[PDB]
Structure formats: structure tokens, C-alpha cells
mmCIF file of N, CA, C and O and ligand atoms in Angstrom:
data_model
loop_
_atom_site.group_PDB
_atom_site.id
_atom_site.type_symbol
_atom_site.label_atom_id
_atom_site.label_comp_id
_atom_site.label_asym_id
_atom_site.label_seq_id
_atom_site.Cartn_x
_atom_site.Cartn_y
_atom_site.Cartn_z
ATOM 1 N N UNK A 693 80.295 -80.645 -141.519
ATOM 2 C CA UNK A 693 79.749 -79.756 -140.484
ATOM 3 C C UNK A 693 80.148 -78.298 -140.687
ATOM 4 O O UNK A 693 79.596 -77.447 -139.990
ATOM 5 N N UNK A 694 81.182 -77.902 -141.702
ATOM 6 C CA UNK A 694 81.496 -76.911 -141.627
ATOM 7 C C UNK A 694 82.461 -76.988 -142.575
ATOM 8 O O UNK A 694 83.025 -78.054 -142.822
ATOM 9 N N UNK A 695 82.861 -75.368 -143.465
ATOM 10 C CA UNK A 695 83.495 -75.674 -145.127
ATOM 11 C C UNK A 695 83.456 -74.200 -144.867
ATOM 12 O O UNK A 695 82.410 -73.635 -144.550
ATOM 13 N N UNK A 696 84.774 -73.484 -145.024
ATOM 14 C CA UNK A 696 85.081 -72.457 -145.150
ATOM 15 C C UNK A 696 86.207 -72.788 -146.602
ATOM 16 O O UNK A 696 86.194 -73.953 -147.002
ATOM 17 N N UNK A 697 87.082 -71.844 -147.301
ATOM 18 C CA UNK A 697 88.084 -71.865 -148.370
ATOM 19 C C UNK A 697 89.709 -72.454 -147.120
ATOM 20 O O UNK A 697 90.589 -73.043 -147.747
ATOM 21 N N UNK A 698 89.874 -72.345 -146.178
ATOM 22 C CA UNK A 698 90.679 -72.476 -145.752
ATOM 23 C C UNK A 698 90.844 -73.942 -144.607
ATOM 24 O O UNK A 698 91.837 -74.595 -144.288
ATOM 25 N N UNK A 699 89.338 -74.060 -144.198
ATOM 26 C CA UNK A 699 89.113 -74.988 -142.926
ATOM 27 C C UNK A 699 87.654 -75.589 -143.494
ATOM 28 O O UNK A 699 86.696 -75.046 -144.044
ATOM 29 N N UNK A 700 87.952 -77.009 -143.086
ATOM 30 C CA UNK A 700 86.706 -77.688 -143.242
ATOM 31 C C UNK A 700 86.482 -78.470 -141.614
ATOM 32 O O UNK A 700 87.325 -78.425 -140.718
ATOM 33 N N UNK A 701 85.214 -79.126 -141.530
ATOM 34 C CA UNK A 701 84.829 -79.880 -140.499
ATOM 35 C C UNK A 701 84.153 -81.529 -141.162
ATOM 36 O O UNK A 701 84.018 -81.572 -142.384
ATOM 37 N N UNK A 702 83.940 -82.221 -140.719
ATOM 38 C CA UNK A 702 83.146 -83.709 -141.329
ATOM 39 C C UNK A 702 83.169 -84.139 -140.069
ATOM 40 O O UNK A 702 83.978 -83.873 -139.180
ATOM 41 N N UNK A 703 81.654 -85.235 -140.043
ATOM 42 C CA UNK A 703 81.349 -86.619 -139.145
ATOM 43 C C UNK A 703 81.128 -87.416 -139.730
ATOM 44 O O UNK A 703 80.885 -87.226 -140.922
ATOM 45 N N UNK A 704 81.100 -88.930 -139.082
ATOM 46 C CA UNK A 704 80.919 -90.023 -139.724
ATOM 47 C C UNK A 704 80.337 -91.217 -138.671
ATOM 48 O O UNK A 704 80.898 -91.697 -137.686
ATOM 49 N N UNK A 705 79.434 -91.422 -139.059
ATOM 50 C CA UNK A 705 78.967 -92.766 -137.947
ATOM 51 C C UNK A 705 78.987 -93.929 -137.924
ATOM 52 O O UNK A 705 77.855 -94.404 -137.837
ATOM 53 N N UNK A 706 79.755 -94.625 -137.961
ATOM 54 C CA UNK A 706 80.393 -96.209 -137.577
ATOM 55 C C UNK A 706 79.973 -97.243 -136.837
ATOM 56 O O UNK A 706 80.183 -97.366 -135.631
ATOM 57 N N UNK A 707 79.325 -98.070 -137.594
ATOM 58 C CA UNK A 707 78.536 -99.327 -136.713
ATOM 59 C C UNK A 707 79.061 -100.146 -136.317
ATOM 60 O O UNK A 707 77.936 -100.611 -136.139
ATOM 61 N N UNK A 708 79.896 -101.103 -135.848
ATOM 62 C CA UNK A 708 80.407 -102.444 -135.998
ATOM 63 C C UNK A 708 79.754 -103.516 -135.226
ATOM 64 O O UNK A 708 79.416 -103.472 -134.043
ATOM 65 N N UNK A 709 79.582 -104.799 -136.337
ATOM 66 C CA UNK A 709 79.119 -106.040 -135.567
ATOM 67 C C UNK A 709 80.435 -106.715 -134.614
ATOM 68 O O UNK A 709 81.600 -106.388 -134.840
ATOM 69 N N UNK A 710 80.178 -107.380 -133.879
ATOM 70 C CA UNK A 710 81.808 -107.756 -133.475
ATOM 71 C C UNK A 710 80.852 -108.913 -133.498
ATOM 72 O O UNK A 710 79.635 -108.821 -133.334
ATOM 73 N N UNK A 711 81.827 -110.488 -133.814
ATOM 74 C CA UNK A 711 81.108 -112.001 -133.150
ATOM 75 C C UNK A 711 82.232 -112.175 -131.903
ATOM 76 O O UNK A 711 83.429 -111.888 -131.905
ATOM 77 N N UNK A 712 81.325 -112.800 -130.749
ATOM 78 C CA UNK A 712 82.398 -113.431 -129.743
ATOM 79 C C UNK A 712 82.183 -114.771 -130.364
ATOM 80 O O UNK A 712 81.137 -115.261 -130.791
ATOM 81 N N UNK A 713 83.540 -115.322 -130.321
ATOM 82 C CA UNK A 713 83.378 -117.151 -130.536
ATOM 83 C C UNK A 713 82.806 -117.811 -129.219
ATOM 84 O O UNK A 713 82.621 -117.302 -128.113
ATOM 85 N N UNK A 714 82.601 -118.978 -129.627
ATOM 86 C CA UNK A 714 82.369 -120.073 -128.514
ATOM 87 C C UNK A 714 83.282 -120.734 -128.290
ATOM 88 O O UNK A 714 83.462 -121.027 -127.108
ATOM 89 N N UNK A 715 83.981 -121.108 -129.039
ATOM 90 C CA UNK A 715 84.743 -122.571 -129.513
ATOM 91 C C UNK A 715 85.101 -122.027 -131.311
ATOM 92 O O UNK A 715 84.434 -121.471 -132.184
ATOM 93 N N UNK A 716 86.465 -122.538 -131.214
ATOM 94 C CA UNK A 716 87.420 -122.174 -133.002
ATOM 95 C C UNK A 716 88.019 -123.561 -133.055
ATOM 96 O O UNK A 716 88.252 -124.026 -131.940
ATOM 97 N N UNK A 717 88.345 -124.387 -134.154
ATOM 98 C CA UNK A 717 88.364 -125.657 -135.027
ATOM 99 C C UNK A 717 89.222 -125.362 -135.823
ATOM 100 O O UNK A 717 88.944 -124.640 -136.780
ATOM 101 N N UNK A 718 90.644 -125.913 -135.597
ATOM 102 C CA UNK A 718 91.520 -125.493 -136.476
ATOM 103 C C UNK A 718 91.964 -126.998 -137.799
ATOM 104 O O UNK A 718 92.085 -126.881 -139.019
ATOM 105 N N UNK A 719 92.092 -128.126 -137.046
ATOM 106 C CA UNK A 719 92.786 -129.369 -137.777
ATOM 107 C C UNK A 719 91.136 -129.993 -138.254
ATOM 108 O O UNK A 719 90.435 -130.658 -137.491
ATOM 109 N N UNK A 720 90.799 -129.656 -139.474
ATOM 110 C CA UNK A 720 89.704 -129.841 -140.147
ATOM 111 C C UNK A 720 89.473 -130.622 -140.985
ATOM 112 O O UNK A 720 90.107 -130.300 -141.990
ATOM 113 N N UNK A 721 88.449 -132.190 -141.264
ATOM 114 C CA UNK A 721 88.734 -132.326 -142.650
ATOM 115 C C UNK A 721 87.295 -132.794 -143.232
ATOM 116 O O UNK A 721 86.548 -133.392 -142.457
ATOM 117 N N UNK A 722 86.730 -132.468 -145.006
ATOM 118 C CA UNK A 722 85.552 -132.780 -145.638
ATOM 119 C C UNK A 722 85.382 -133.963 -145.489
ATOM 120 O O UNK A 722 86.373 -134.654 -145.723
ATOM 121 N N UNK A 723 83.987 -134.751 -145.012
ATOM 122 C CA UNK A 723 83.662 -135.740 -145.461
ATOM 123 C C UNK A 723 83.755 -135.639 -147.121
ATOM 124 O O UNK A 723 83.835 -134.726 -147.943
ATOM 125 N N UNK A 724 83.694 -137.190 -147.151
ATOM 126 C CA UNK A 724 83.416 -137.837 -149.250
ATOM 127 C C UNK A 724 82.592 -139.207 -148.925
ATOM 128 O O UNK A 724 82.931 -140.061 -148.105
ATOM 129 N N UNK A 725 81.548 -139.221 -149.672
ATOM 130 C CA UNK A 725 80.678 -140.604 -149.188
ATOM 131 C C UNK A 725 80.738 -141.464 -150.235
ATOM 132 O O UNK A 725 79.810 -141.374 -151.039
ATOM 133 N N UNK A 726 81.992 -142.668 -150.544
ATOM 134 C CA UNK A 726 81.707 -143.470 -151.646
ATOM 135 C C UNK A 726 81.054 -144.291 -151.791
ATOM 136 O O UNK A 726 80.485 -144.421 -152.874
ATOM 137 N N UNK A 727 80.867 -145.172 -150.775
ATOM 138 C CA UNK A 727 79.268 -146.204 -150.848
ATOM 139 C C UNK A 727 80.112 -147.490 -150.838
ATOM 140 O O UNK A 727 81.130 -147.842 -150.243
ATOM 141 N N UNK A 728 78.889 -148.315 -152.160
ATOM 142 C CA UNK A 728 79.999 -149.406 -152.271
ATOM 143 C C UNK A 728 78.216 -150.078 -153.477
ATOM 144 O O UNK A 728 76.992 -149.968 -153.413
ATOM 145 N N UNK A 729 79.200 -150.685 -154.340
ATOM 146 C CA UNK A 729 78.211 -151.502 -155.314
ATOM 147 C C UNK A 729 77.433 -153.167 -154.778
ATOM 148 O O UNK A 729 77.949 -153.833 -153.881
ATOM 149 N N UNK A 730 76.600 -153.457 -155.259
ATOM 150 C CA UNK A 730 75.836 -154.661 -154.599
ATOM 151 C C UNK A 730 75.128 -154.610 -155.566
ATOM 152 O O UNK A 730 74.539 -153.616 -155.989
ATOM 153 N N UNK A 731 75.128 -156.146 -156.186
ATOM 154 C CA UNK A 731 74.287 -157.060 -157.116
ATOM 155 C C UNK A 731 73.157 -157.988 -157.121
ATOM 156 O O UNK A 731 73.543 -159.058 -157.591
ATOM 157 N N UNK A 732 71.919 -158.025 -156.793
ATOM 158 C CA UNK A 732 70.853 -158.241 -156.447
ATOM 159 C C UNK A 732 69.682 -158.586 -157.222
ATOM 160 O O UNK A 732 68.848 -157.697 -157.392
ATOM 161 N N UNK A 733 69.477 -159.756 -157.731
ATOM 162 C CA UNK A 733 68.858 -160.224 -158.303
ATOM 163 C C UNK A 733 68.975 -159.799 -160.180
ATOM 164 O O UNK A 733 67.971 -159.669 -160.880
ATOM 165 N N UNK A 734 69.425 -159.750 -160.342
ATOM 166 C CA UNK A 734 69.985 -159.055 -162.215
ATOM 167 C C UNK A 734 70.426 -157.433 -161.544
ATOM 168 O O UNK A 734 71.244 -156.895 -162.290
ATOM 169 N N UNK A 735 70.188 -156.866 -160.745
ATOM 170 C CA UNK A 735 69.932 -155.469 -160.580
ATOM 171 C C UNK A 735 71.691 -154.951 -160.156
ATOM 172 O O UNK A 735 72.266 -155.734 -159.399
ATOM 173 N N UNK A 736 72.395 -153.864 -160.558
ATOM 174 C CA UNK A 736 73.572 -153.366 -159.851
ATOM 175 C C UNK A 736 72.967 -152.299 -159.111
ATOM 176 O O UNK A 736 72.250 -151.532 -159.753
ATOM 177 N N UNK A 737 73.109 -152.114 -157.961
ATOM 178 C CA UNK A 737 72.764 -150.999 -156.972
ATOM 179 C C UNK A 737 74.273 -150.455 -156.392
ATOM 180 O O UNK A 737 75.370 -150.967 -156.172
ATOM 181 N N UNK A 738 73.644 -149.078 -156.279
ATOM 182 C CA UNK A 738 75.067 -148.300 -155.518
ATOM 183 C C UNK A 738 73.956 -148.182 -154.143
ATOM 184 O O UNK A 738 72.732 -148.055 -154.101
ATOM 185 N N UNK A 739 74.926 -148.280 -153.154
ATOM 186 C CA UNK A 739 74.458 -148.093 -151.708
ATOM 187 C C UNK A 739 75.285 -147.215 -150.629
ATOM 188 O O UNK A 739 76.482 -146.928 -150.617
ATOM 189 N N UNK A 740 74.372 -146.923 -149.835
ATOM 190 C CA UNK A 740 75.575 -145.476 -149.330
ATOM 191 C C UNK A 740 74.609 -145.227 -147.842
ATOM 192 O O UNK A 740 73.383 -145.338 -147.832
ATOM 193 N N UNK A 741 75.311 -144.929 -146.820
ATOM 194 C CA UNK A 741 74.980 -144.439 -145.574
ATOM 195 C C UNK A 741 74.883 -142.759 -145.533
ATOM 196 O O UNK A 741 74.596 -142.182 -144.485
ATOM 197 N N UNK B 100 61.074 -163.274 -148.375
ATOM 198 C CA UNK B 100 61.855 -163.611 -146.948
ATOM 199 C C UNK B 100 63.219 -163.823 -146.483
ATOM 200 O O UNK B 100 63.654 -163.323 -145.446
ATOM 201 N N UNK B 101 63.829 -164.510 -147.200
ATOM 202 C CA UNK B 101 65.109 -164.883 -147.184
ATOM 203 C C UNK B 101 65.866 -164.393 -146.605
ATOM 204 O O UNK B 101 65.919 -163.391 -147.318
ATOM 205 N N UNK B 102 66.876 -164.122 -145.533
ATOM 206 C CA UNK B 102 68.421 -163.405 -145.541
ATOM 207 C C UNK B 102 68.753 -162.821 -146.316
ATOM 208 O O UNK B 102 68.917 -163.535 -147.305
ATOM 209 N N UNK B 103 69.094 -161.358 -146.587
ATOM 210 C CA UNK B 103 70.233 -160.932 -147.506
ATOM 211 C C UNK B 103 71.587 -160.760 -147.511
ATOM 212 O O UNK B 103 72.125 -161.287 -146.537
ATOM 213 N N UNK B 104 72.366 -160.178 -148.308
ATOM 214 C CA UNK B 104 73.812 -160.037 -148.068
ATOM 215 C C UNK B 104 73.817 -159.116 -146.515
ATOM 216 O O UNK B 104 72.927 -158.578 -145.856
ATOM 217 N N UNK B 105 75.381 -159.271 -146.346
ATOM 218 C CA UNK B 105 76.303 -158.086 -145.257
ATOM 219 C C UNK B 105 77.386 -157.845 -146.156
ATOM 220 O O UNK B 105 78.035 -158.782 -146.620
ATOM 221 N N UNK B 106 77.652 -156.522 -146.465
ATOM 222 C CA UNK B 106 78.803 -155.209 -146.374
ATOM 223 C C UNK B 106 79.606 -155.055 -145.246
ATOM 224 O O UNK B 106 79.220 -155.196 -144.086
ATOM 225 N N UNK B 107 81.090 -154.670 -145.728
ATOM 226 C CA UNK B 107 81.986 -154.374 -144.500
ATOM 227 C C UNK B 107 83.406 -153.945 -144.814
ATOM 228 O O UNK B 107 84.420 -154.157 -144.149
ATOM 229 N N UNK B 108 83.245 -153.165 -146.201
ATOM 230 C CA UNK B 108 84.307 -152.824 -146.720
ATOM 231 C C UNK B 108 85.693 -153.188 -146.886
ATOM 232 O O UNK B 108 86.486 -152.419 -147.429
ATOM 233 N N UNK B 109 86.083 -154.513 -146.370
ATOM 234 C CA UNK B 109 86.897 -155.507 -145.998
ATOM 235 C C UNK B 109 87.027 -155.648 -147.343
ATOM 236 O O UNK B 109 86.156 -156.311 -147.906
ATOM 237 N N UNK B 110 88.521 -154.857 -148.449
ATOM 238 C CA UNK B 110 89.220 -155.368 -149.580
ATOM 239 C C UNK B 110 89.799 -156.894 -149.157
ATOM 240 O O UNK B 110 89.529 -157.763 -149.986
ATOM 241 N N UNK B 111 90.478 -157.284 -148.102
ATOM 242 C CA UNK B 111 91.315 -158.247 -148.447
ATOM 243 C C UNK B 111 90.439 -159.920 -148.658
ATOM 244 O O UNK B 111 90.804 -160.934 -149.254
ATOM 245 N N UNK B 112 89.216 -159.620 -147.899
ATOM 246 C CA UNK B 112 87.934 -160.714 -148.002
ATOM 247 C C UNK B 112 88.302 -160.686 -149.334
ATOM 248 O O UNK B 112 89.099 -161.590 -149.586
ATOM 249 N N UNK B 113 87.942 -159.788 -150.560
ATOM 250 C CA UNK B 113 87.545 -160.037 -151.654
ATOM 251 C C UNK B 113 89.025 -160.088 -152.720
ATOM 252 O O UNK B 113 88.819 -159.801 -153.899
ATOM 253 N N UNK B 114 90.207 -160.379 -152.387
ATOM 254 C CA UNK B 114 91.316 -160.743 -153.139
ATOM 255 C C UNK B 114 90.801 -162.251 -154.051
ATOM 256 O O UNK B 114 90.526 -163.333 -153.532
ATOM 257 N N UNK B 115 90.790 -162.056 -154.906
ATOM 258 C CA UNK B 115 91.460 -163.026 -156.126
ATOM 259 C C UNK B 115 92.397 -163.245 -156.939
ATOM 260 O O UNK B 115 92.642 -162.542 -157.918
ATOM 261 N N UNK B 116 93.055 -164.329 -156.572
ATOM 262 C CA UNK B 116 94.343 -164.529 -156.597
ATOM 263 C C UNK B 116 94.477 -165.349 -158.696
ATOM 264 O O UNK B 116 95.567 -165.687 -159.158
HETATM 265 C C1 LIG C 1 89.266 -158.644 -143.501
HETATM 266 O O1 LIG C 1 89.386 -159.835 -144.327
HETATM 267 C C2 LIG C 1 90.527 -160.696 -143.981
HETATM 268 C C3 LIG C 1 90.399 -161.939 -144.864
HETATM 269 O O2 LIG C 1 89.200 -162.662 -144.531
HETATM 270 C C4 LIG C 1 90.552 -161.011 -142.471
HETATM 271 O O3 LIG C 1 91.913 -161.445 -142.169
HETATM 272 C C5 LIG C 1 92.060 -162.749 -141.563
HETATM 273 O O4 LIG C 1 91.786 -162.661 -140.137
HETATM 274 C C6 LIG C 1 91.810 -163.996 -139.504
HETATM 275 C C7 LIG C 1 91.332 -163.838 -138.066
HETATM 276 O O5 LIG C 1 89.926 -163.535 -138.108
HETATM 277 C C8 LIG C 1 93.213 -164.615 -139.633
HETATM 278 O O6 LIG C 1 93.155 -166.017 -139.247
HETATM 279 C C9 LIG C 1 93.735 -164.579 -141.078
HETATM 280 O O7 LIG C 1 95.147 -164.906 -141.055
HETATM 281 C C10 LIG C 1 93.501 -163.234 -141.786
HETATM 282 N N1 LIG C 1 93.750 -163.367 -143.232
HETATM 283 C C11 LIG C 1 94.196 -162.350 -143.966
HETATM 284 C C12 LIG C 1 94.308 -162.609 -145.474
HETATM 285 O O8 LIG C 1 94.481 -161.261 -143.476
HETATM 286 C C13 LIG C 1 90.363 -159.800 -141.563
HETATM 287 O O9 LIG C 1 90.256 -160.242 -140.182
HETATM 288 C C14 LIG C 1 89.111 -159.048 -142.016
HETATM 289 N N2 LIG C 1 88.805 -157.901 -141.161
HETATM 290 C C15 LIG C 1 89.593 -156.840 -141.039
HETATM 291 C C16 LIG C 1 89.053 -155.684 -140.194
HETATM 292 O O10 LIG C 1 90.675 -156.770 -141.602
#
């Protein structure tokens, strides 16, 4: 805004998102889906939910 | 037609001794 040899001036405009939570989940853990094998007429099948 | 198998993840059912 302003620049002399001795004194300067500057602006700057600053947005911020903020999130409010709902609900935070601390003791967490990944599912792993191993299934399970089944033998069916000559055939090996893997099967899984 | 027939019936098929049931699953039930039950290791100790399937011990062979
Ligand atoms: C898993 O398989 C075992 C073996 O078939 C079952 O354990 C038996 O349970 C009966 C009662 O239903 C008892 O008379 C036997 O003494 C048990 N035997 C053994 C080797 O444990 C067991 O009930 C089945 N189900 C689960 C969830 O474990």
C-alpha cells in the first residue's frame, strides 16, 4: 500500500475454512475379509461375505 | 436340488487328530 526508502505499508487477505465436527472416533480398527475355501463338485471356491 | 453345505468358521469342528 505504500513503499517509501525508509517506511513501507502491505495487506493481505485471509480466507479460512474452519470444519465443526459432529461426532470424533478415537479407538479405531480396519476391517480384513478372509473368507473361507469350499469344495464343490471337483471345483475349489473361495467364498466371502 | 439337493441341500448344500453350511459354513461357521468353527476350527475345533474340523481338528484331526
Ligand atoms: C465348535 O466346534 C466344537 C466341536 O464340535 C463344539 O464344541 C463342543 O460343544 C458341545 C456342546 O454343543 C460339547 O458337548 C463338547 O464337549 C464340545 N467339544 C469340543 C471339542 O469343544 C463347539 O460347541 C462349536 N461351536 C463353538 C462356537 O465353539
Amino acid at each position: 500500500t505504500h513503499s517509501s526508502p525508509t517506511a513501507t505499508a502491505w495487506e493481505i487477505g485471509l480466507y479460512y475454512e474452519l470444519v465443526i465436527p459432529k461426532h470424533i472416533y478415537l479407538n479405531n480398527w480396519n476391517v480384513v475379509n478372509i473368507g473361507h475355501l469350499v469344495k464343490s463338485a471337483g471345483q475349489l471356491t473361495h467364498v466371502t461375505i | 436340488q439337493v441341500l448344500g453345505p453350511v459354513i461357521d468358521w468353527n476350527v475345533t469342528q474340523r481338528a484331526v487328530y
